[PDB]
Amino acid sequence: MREIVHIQAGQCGNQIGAKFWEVISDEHGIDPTGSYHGDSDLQLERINVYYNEAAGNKYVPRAILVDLEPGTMDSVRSGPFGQIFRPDNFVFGQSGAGNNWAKGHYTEGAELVDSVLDVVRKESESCDCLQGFQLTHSLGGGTGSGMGTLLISKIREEYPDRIMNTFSVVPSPKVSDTVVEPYNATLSVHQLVENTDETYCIDNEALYDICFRTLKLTTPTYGDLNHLVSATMSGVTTCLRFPGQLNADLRKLAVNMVPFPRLHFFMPGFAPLTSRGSQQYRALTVPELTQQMFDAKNMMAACDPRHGRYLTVAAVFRGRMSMKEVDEQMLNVQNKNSSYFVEWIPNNVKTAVCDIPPRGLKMSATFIGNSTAIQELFKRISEQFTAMFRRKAFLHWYTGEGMDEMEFTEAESNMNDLVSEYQQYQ
Amino acid sequence: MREIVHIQAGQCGNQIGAKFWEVISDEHGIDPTGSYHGDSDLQLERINVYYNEAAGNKYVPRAILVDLEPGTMDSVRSGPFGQIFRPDNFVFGQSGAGNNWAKGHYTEGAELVDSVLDVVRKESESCDCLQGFQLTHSLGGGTGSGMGTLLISKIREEYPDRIMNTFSVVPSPKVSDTVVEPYNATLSVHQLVENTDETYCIDNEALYDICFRTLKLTTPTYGDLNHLVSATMSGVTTCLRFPGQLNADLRKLAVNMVPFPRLHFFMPGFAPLTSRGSQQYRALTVPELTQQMFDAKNMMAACDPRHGRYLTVAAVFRGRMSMKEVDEQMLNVQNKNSSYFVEWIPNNVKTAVCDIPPRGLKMSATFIGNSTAIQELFKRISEQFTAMFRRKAFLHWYTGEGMDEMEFTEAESNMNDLVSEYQQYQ
Amino acid sequence: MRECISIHVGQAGVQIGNACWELYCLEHGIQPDGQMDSFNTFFSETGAGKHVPRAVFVDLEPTVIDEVRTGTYRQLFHPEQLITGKEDAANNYARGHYTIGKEIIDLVLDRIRKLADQCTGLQGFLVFHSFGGGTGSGFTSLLMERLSVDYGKKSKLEFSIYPAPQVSTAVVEPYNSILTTHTTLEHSDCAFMVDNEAIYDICRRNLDIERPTYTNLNRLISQIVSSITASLRFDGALNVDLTEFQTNLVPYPRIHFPLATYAPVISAEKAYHEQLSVAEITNACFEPANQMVKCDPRHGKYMACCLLYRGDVVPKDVNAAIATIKTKRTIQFVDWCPTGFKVGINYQPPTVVPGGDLAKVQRAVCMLSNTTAIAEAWARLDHKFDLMYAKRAFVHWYVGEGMEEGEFSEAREDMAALEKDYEEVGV
Amino acid sequence: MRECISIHVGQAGVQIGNACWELYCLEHGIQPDGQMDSFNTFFSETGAGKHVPRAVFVDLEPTVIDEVRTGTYRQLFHPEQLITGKEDAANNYARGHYTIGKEIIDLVLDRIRKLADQCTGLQGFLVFHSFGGGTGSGFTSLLMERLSVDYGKKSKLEFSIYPAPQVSTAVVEPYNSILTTHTTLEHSDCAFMVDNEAIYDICRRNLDIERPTYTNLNRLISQIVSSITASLRFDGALNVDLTEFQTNLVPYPRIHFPLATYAPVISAEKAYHEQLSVAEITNACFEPANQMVKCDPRHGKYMACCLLYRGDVVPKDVNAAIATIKTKRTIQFVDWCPTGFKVGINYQPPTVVPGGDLAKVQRAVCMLSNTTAIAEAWARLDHKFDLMYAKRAFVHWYVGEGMEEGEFSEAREDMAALEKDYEEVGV
Numbered sequence A, B: 001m002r003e004i005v006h007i008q009a010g011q012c013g014n015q016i017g018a019k020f021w022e023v024i025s026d027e028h029g030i031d032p033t034g035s036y037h038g039d040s041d042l043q044l045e046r047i048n049v050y051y052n053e054a055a056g057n058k059y060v061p062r063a064i065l066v067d068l069e070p071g072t073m074d075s076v077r078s079g080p081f082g083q084i085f086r087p088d089n090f091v092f093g094q095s096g097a098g099n100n101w102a103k104g105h106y107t108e109g110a111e112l113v114d115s116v117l118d119v120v121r122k123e124s125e126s127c128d129c130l131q132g133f134q135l136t137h138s139l140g141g142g143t144g145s146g147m148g149t150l151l152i153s154k155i156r157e158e159y160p161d162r163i164m165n166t167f168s169v170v171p172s173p174k175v176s177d178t179v180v181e182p183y184n185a186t187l188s189v190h191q192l193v194e195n196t197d198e199t200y201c202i203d204n205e206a207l208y209d210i211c212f213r214t215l216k217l218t219t220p221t222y223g224d225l226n227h228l229v230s231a232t233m234s235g236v237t238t239c240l241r242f243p244g245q246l247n248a249d250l251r252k253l254a255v256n257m258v259p260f261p262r263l264h265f266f267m268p269g270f271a272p273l274t275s276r277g278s279q280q281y282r283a284l285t286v287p288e289l290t291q292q293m294f295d296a297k298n299m300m301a302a303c304d305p306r307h308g309r310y311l312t313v314a315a316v317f318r319g320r321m322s323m324k325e326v327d328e329q330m331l332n333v334q335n336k337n338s339s340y341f342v343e344w345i346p347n348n349v350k351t352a353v354c355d356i357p358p359r360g361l362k363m364s365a366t367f368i369g370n371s372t373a374i375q376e377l378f379k380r381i382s383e384q385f386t387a388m389f390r391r392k393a394f395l396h397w398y399t400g401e402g403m404d405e406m407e408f409t410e411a412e413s414n415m416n417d418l419v420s421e422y423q424q425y426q
Numbered sequence C, D: 001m002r003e004c005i006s007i008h009v010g011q012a013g014v015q016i017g018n019a020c021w022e023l024y025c026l027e028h029g030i031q032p033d034g035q036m037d038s039f040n041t042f043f044s045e046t047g048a049g050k051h052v053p054r055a056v057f058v059d060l061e062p063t064v065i066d067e068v069r070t071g072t073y074r075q076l077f078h079p080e081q082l083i084t085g086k087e088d089a090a091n092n093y094a095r096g097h098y099t100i101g102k103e104i105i106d107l108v109l110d111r112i113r114k115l116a117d118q119c120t121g122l123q124g125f126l127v128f129h130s131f132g133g134g135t136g137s138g139f140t141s142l143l144m145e146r147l148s149v150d151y152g153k154k155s156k157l158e159f160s161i162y163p164a165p166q167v168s169t170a171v172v173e174p175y176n177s178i179l180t181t182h183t184t185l186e187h188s189d190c191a192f193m194v195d196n197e198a199i200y201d202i203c204r205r206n207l208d209i210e211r212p213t214y215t216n217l218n219r220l221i222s223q224i225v226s227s228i229t230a231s232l233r234f235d236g237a238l239n240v241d242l243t244e245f246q247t248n249l250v251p252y253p254r255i256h257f258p259l260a261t262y263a264p265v266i267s268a269e270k271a272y273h274e275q276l277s278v279a280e281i282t283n284a285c286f287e288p289a290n291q292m293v294k295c296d297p298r299h300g301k302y303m304a305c306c307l308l309y310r311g312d313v314v315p316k317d318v319n320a321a322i323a324t325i326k327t328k329r330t331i332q333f334v335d336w337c338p339t340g341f342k343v344g345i346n347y348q349p350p351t352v353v354p355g356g357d358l359a360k361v362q363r364a365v366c367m368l369s370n371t372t373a374i375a376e377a378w379a380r381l382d383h384k385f386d387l388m389y390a391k392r393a394f395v396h397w398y399v400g401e402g403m404e405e406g407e408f409s410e411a412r413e414d415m416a417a418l419e420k421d422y423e424e425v426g427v
């Protein structure tokens, strides 16, 4: 039971995915071809959560790779851990999207999505008790954004009682990365608000800040960014794969993190984040870890959480630790700075812990924040949208594929309503 | 007892036949000259089912090769396993048929058929208890189609209490392969409806789809297609040659598969069908096997079975397996998708199983479907027929050999009645 | 002495018989080749010392019996006890009966006669067939009819493979079973019936096995058979002869069908997480899912129940258990029967084969039950038949060999009558 | 004899149960594999000699029970006593109750029935859950309700993990706890409640440990449980049976909540800087910080107190201690109860596990207390709930599975009523 089906969509989604599968492989003692070389039975206890088993003690990611844009997935295939994936789980088309949500969601994507659905259905049958679907995509592209949304819609329709979580790479609002990005992001957000249970919002600006300010690093590559994302992802599902004291789960996190159904946009983080060079200068106390977790500079969304109240926060620890220390730390944090946590929810925090630290660390932790401050992100996107749409700039590319003006307007309206709702709890 | 006499007719029939004899030879440990080199007594227990024994522990196919067209059979003879056949079992004429059913059935074929009958009679005497006759031919040619039908008529007349089964290669309706094909097919079908107990309907289009879509293959040759056919053929008779739990038989299959006497046209399939390259990506569970068996894309007739109800289905498994798993799987299939099986027959499926997997596989299975959807195939053929016959196009070639218009009309009528009957149970 | 013969007919029957013979060999100390006290009930005493069973082995299918003839339990059997022909009926009732079987049947009868000629008190027969399989249904019916003429006073018990409601094997079972019922009814005395779905369920829950075979099923069946028969062979507190299962189980002379169920059917793992006391075993016996058919016995009054305790068994405990059972409100009983339970207690315990999953137990039980709750299954079968027959599915095959269609109607009428009788009994 | 069963449900409950079982194994001489006099109260006597406990182990979470099933205390357990499902409620009361639990509950009931079938005088149950955790609150409530129908006269004691005022774990506890209170209330008899903050405080001061775990907590809980139960199993001057904790602790039939506290809880270091006399222990028991919940008991009159002395204990000394306690002005008592204290004195001392920090003591005590001082915590909880519910926080989750919102209102009303009752009692 507790089995998860993974989907990766578009270029970004595929790239992050590759890293994710490397990291999970490492964690579960799977070598690049798919053989197990672990020394602990803990490693295989719940290996089924991510991997199917095949003849000859072969383990295969329960993973589907989708891209209308071909060649990105060819790179994945050519890569080191590319050989672990099932060839029949590569679903790809013969035309790009030109960063066009409409082509991903309405036309080109609609032609490919049937295949993906078929594969998903097949995957679902090998679940004893399907926990849900985990998606990796990007907002600002065409495939991950449009087709990702399309696929999500379909899957929710077919499996409405299973959990739908998305790790979505959003724009960097201070320095935007395509021209039609705002249009795409706005169109996707509309779909995600309605058709997912949780969305982890990751932005490259924040990642770079983390790399530079916190980790004291330079020359960071997309690979490194993917690594960081993958670590958070793995952290999220640790309690489904392994033992512990308080064990989390997807819906458990959703239960503690989503106090109103539409407010399900999270800012993920990891701790510790210090330099590789200056290792010995610091040590691993639970208080230090929590400090790292909670500090704005260590978050991977493009907000100052200090410009808003936390509705709820989930901390997931790995390593054998004093629960007293944990709880007391949380309490102290709440007491000292009660203004940053909304006063209408007693005990805004949540703890979970797993007796199994990942590779090097003795103590690691994953942060999941739901703050009213995230309104800023949406607000800026809506500002961007309006400036263009009021002049109908770039709109012909979308109307040409059968999209209507009214839809755009409605999407904007929904985005604004989201912002308003967030402001309510601020 | 349980001995089968094999007849191969025409070019196609001979070619498929060669492959079939190779495969059966391999299965029974017979080398290309006819010596036994097996390591299991299971192999020889019921070797008599297909092979006669001769002096010097020589084994000879109980097989008759017929073609009015000479040279095709010369190729067979020249071939590797060509040396196993009895020279006296080659019956051939000195004139082709020009893809003309009338020449095969009425005139040229009538001159050769006596010889074939004589050989058949001789063959029959070496049966302890003759199970029946197994024919390989093609519809759309002249010899396999016309002369095949002629021969079948004769044999049924002489051995009406023995089972008459035909593996018949039909047209590919979306891209037809001769000009007079529709005429030939229609003429043959008439004869087969009345004079055989079961006909396995194989179409090259479906085979190519299997090769390309399912097996992930390219550059497939007629050899490869023959292989696929041969595998199904061998699967069909496994329970006569070997041990098991539930053992099938020809009439047993007919008993479970033919609920009305004229509805005896089957869609054969094999499973598993996955890529050679992507082997490790999948494994051999009974559920997976059944999925492969039942999926439309894996069938070798030119229907969507989803556009009709299954009247009955026989699954024949090879390998040591959990009967619980089998039965339960079947039950689940029926429950989930009861609309695709006619509701007037409780338990539309049938299972048989043999403790002896063929060469490589641990678990293999042969599918035999009787669906109302097969009406489509006949319908298209009748459409083809009518368009030509209403203008009496190409008819002079047939009238010239003594065929009458009325016969054609009657054949069409019978075909239409067949379609109507199938529609009844839809 | 209480000395008897068995009959194993059709593929399934033959398979069951193999298992049975293996079990017998284990029990009585006999080695697969015939070498080693009271064994001789089945194994008619022999020339050079090596024991040879008394069983009729029949299959019109050659293959299964051919397998047996090259097996381990091989020379044990007489060449003649095993019989062969040429081809299956292929689930065709009109071939075991009427056409092809009326040919071999004479031989079988002769064999049976010969076997009888060794008995000094032939208490009767045990017959293994299938309500469904073509050979072992028509042919078996025919055989039973023949026996009825040649042995009027001798009991003829049958072990039967009823088809489960939901699961199926070959899609002409509803005809065949009904036909068998029509022609078996008046010639057999008792027909001990076991489904397969129920067995599978038991395996999944009780034995903790989710990957079963036919072999396992056969072994289970053999165990039950052994339990049934052991009072003939070994000593006991209370000895249940074959002829008791007429008189303590057939309340009316058409109701010939009991459900045969076994306990404890638990593996070694959570056996040691259990006491396995007499009372517990008894309780297990009357629970719904542990039954070896698909009835909800809570939907149906019990007519006659019969229990066959084996091993370390104190009668007091048994009595207590029975009293407890009687007390329970859910275990319903008929208006007309107070003395509902028949008890056999045997000093010899059951014996476990290598490969058989059921672990060693000091005490075990086999229960035999007649109830109105069997009627549900019958009704279902009837319904299936009716649905098939109205559109004349596969009727031309049976009719085309040698039958009237009115036979089918007659069978249906008989079934209806049976149902009515059951209803009356319930009242 | 005085012979009984336990229930351990949800993650926390299961954890507690492990510790409990370990402690029991230590006490009664049993080795982790079941090998070794009066042990048999819990460990129902067994087949081959190896003892097997009577505990219901339930978790809809697979993981915790899976861990147990591959632990050291492994074969000790019966496969069935441990139960599994698929997924957590995830602190969702509307899943243990209503939706997902109504499925497993039947199985649990069956198990319980089976366990009862071994008792020759089933004095009742011990139940381990959490006022907060999703499984062990809804599900446990459901179970208790079911038990109420099937065992009316049998005591059902509960060990409860109340959430501390300030500290929290999962931020939907205020709903769940309240729901549990609403649906437990009338089906349980006694609910022994322990916070975690209090325990931590105790550890910091009394045991001189500032780096605790859950394991330590579990061990402490197990100790308390052992103290509670030991009069069933071993001999004593005065024997407190399970049914006494109804009658010497529930002054009115809605007030079902006592505080469970233990002494001496001091490590080896300044144990030898202490006498550890009876009077001192008694004094420690009534002090504010040594209590295992967050009440200021000086803010609340005592209704009923119950003490369970273990080891080298002379009743005279106990009496003296009690007199002294009575004399004290700060230890307040109700207007309507003069005989405030109930005493159990047991010749067997407590037994210390390897790894357990609490050192070997010749004498020790467990105290159980009912007071108006528990009401503060209840009030706080109510307040929390009200603050949550007015803005409809996370209500759609419970409602979206299967609930009325009026239920919440009802629960609140019940709480208010309880508060009023407490006030009246204080008066």
Ligand SMILES: CC(=O)O[C@H]1C(=O)[C@@]2(C)[C@H]([C@H](OC(=O)c3ccccc3)[C@]3(O)C[C@H](OC(=O)[C@H](O)[C@@H](NC(=O)c4ccccc4)c4ccccc4)C(C)=C1C3(C)C)[C@]1(OC(C)=O)CO[C@@H]1C[C@@H]2O
Pocket: A022, A023, A026, A027, A215, A224, A225, A227, A228, A230, A231, A232, A234, A235, A272, A273, A274, A275, A276, A279, A358, A359, A360, A361, A364
């Ligand atoms: C000698 C030594 O102790 O080296 C450490 C190290 O120096 C530090 C700096 C590591 C290092 O990580 C990075 O520099 C980094 C680079 C790009 C993006 C993000 C991080 C390290 O590379 C990462 C590596 O992490 C792991 O081994 C974890 O198991 C981690 N694994 C991966 O990310 C991974 C990398 C390559 C291939 C496969 C997996 C993990 C974390 C969460 C969940 C699952 C796995 C560790 C501890 C170290 C090095 C090697 C220097 C740190 O990161 C992690 C994720 O542990 C960065 O801050 C921490 C603190 C560590 O002490």
Ligand SMILES: CC(=O)O[C@H]1C(=O)[C@@]2(C)[C@H]([C@H](OC(=O)c3ccccc3)[C@]3(O)C[C@H](OC(=O)[C@H](O)[C@@H](NC(=O)c4ccccc4)c4ccccc4)C(C)=C1C3(C)C)[C@]1(OC(C)=O)CO[C@@H]1C[C@@H]2O
Pocket: B022, B023, B026, B027, B215, B224, B225, B227, B228, B230, B231, B232, B234, B235, B272, B273, B274, B275, B276, B279, B358, B359, B360, B361, B364
């Ligand atoms: C290394 C290895 O395991 O190779 C396999 C293999 O890769 C696969 C892909 C085989 C392969 O089959 C094909 O690629 C194929 C080519 C044309 C038409 C149809 C199939 C294989 O060639 C076929 C071959 O089949 C057999 O050996 C069976 O006994 C089969 N034999 C023949 O068809 C045969 C071929 C040449 C000469 C004589 C006989 C058979 C099947 C049913 C009944 C009787 C015999 C097997 C398992 C393999 C190879 C060799 C790669 C598969 O086919 C069969 C019939 O087994 C295709 O999907 C299955 C799955 C197998 O795993």
Ligand SMILES: CC[C@H](/C=C(/C)[C@@H]1C[C@@H](OC)C[C@H](O)C(C)(C)[C@@]2(O)O[C@@H](C[C@@H](OC)[C@H](O)C(=O)O1)C[C@@H](OC)[C@H]2O)CO
Pocket: A290, A291, A294, A295, A296, A297, A305, A306, A333, A337, A340
């Ligand atoms: C509780 C939620 C939370 C709220 C606040 C403001 C938290 C509280 C504390 O961390 C837990 C701050 C912390 O105790 C420190 C002072 C050690 C420190 O880390 O503060 C930051 C600046 C601070 O914001 C001012 C930070 O960015 C932050 O986020 O702080 C500089 C940093 O230089 C090394 C160091 O001086 C937002 O998620």
Ligand SMILES: CC[C@H](/C=C(/C)[C@@H]1C[C@@H](OC)C[C@H](O)C(C)(C)[C@@]2(O)O[C@@H](C[C@@H](OC)[C@H](O)C(=O)O1)C[C@@H](OC)[C@H]2O)CO
Pocket: A117, A118, A119, A121, A122, B290, B291, B294, B295, B296, B297, B305, B306, B333, B337, B340
């Ligand atoms: C029972 C008789 C039977 C009826 C049906 C419709 C059956 C049932 C199921 O198979 C047993 C389908 C099956 O469970 C899957 C979903 C895994 C799957 O195989 O379905 C097909 C499409 C489906 O038709 C839609 C298929 O073609 C088919 O035949 O399905 C795509 C495929 O991509 C990998 C995969 O997604 C016809 O013989």
Ligand SMILES: Nc1nc2c(ncn2[C@@H]2O[C@H](COP(=O)(O)OP(=O)(O)OP(=O)(O)O)[C@@H](O)[C@H]2O)c(=O)[nH]1
Pocket: B245, B246, B247, C009, C010, C011, C012, C013, C015, C016, C060, C061, C087, C088, C089, C090, C091, C092, C130, C132, C133, C134, C135, C136, C137, C161, C163, C169, C196, C214, C215, C217, C218
């Ligand atoms: N328990 C059990 N059931 C079997 C076995 N073999 C077959 N069956 C069941 O018996 C029925 C099929 O009848 P078979 O005995 O195989 O048929 P048959 O008597 O040989 O008759 P034909 O083959 O039709 O001539 C199905 O319900 C099978 O599940 C077996 O070894 N054990």
Ligand SMILES: Nc1nc2c(ncn2[C@@H]2O[C@H](COP(=O)(O)OP(=O)(O)OP(=O)(O)O)[C@@H](O)[C@H]2O)c(=O)[nH]1
Pocket: A245, A246, A247, D009, D010, D011, D012, D013, D015, D016, D060, D061, D087, D088, D089, D090, D091, D092, D130, D132, D133, D134, D135, D136, D137, D161, D163, D169, D196, D214, D215, D217, D218
């Ligand atoms: N003392 C103690 N408390 C525990 C333990 N495990 C969990 N808890 C407490 O129990 C509460 C959480 O409930 P759990 O038992 O973990 O939850 P659950 O019953 O599994 O329910 P779900 O996980 O929500 O399905 C928190 O207050 C924890 O501090 C334990 O081993 N000992």
Ligand SMILES: Nc1nc2c(ncn2[C@@H]2O[C@H](COP(=O)(O)OP(=O)(O)O)[C@@H](O)[C@H]2O)c(=O)[nH]1
Pocket: A009, A010, A011, A012, A013, A015, A016, A069, A097, A099, A138, A139, A140, A141, A142, A143, A144, A145, A169, A170, A171, A177, A204, A222, A223, A225, A226
């Ligand atoms: N973190 C991360 N961002 C990426 C990666 N690849 C592309 N991006 C970002 O994704 C956005 C571009 O979308 P992309 O996925 O490449 O387009 P698509 O293939 O049409 O979906 C930009 O904001 C890029 O910065 C990656 O591997 N990691």
Ligand SMILES: Nc1nc2c(ncn2[C@@H]2O[C@H](COP(=O)(O)OP(=O)(O)O)[C@@H](O)[C@H]2O)c(=O)[nH]1
Pocket: B009, B010, B011, B012, B013, B015, B016, B069, B097, B099, B138, B139, B140, B141, B142, B143, B144, B145, B169, B170, B171, B177, B204, B222, B223, B225, B226
């Ligand atoms: N599957 C298969 N089809 C064949 C083969 N040879 C010919 N055909 C098909 O048979 C039909 C032509 O008939 P053919 O047998 O060659 O003519 P004939 O000699 O007059 O009977 C066409 O549909 C061909 O595609 C073969 O070896 N295998």
Ligand SMILES: [Mg+2]
Pocket: C010, C011, C060, C061, C088, C135
């Ligand atoms: Mg047979």
Ligand SMILES: [Mg+2]
Pocket: D010, D011, D060, D061, D088, D135
């Ligand atoms: Mg849990």
